[PDB]
Amino acid sequence: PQITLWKRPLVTIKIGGQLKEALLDTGADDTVLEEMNLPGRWKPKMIGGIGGFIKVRQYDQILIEICGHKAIGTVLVGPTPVNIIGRNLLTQIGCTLNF
Amino acid sequence: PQITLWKRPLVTIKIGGQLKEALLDTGADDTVLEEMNLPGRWKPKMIGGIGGFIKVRQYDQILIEICGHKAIGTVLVGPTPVNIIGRNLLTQIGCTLNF
Numbered sequence: 161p162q163i164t165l166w167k168r169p170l171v172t173i174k175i176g177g178q179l180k181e182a183l184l185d186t187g188a189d190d191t192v193l194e195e196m197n198l199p200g201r202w203k204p205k206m207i208g209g210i211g212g213f214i215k216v217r218q219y220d221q222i223l224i225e226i227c228g229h230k231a232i233g234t235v236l237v238g239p240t241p242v243n244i245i246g247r248n249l250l251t252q253i254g255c256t257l258n259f
Numbered sequence: 260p261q262i263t264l265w266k267r268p269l270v271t272i273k274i275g276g277q278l279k280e281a282l283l284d285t286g287a288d289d290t291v292l293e294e295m296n297l298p299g300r301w302k303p304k305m306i307g308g309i310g311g312f313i314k315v316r317q318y319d320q321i322l323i324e325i326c327g328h329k330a331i332g333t334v335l336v337g338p339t340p341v342n343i344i345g346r347n348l349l350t351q352i353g354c355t356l357n358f
């Protein structure tokens with residue numbers, strides 16, 4: 161599909177057996193998901209943006225389906241106000257910017 | 260152009276007559292640039308990011324060229340970690356996401 165940017169590029173994703181809404185975000189190196197209780201090992205991390213830093217848990221090799229496109233990679237989980245699909249996964253679903 | 264996402268989508272911009280580098284950021288509603296001198300009146304505003312809220316100067320109807328494409332719109336100036344081009348300007352240059 162082609163997504164215009166008049167509105168936030170929100171799409172449905174599937175992660176940890178749950179469906180969620182997330183932004184397709186070319187400004188995020190990595191994917192950041194709102195607080196959820198994923199199983200398995202994780203590593204603490206701090207990520208910075210406008211307003212400062214938030215503490216997140218880094219999970220590796222997490223499977224996510226974005227608009228029916230499967231992807232697997234690093235997912236950071238923490239108190240983000242929004243689910244963010246970052247470039248580490250956007251490359252895997254074949255997403256590009258075009259103008 | 261078509262821009263892949265294996266690297267950060269960084270582009271050269273011109274604003275106030277000066278060249279700068281900025282990130283094409285589909286997860287940003289607004290365009291936020293690092294502290295700089297811009298001609299024109301401005302008004303104090305607040306914006307929130309992943310880490311909280313910051314004070315910005317809002318410049319309206321500002322001329323800005325992005326990778327050779329002209330836009331005129333709102334530019335917020337403040338302590339952002341990175342120059343980001345948000346959807347208010349990405350729409351003006353005809354930018355879409357595609358997968």
Ligand SMILES: CC[C@H](C)CN(C[C@@H](O)[C@H](Cc1ccccc1)NC(=O)O[C@H]1CO[C@H]2OCC[C@H]21)S(=O)(=O)c1ccc2c(c1)CC[C@@H]2O
Pocket residue numbers: 185187188189190191192207208209210241242244246282284285286287288289290291306307308309310340341343345
């Ligand atoms: C530095 C470049 C940018 C700022 C990196 N951001 C990604 C941007 O798209 C954020 C997304 C977003 C955050 C909160 C709420 C809504 C949307 N938009 C943003 O702040 O937009 C501003 C301007 O417009 C307004 O609309 C939206 C909010 C206001 S991040 O979320 O801070 C991030 C993600 C991953 C990762 C990091 C940092 C660090 C490592 C990790 O990979």
